[PDB]
Amino acid sequence: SLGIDMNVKESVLCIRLTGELDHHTAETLKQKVTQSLEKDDIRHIVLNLEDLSFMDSSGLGVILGRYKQIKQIGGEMVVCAISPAVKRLFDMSGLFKIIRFEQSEQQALLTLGVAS
C-alpha cells in the first residue's frame, strides 16, 4: 500500500506520496533518485506525504539521499507533511537539519523557498 504524486511548479517537482515509508515504498523514490540526480537544468523539489504513517528508517535514508542530490545538483531539497509521530525519526537522528523539515506551513517553503 503506497501512492505517488508528482507536480511541477516553475521548476519545483512536487512529490506527493501517500501510503507507507519503508524500504518497500522507499523504493519507488529510489528511482526518483536518478531523476533528481540530474533531471536537466536546475529544478526544485517539493516533498509532502499526506499519508505518513509507518515511515521507518528505510526511506529515511532514501530521502536523505535526495537532499544531497538536489543540493549537489544546484538546487535545494525540501520536505514537509511531518507529524508528532514521524518527525521523531529526524528529531532523534538529530540530522533533521539535513532534511530541513517543517509542518504543512512549509507548504509554501516546500516550493523550495524559491518560487513565489
Curated annotation (Swiss-Prot):
The keyword Phosphoprotein applies. Phosphorylated by SpoIIAB on a serine residue. One of its GO terms (biological process) is sporulation resulting in formation of a cellular spore. The keyword Phosphoprotein applies. It comes from the Bacteria. The modification Phosphoserine is found at S57. GO terms for molecular function: anti-sigma factor antagonist activity; antisigma factor binding. Residues 2-112 form the STAS domain. Keywords: Phosphoprotein, Sporulation. Signal peptide: none annotated. Belongs to the anti-sigma-factor antagonist family. In the phosphorylated form it could act as an anti-anti-sigma factor that counteracts SpoIIAB and thus releases sigma f from inhibition. NCBIfam families: ant_ant_sig, spore_II_AA. This is Anti-sigma F factor antagonist. It comes from Bacillus subtilis (strain 168). The lineage of its organism: Bacteria, Bacillati, Bacillota, Bacilli, Bacillales.
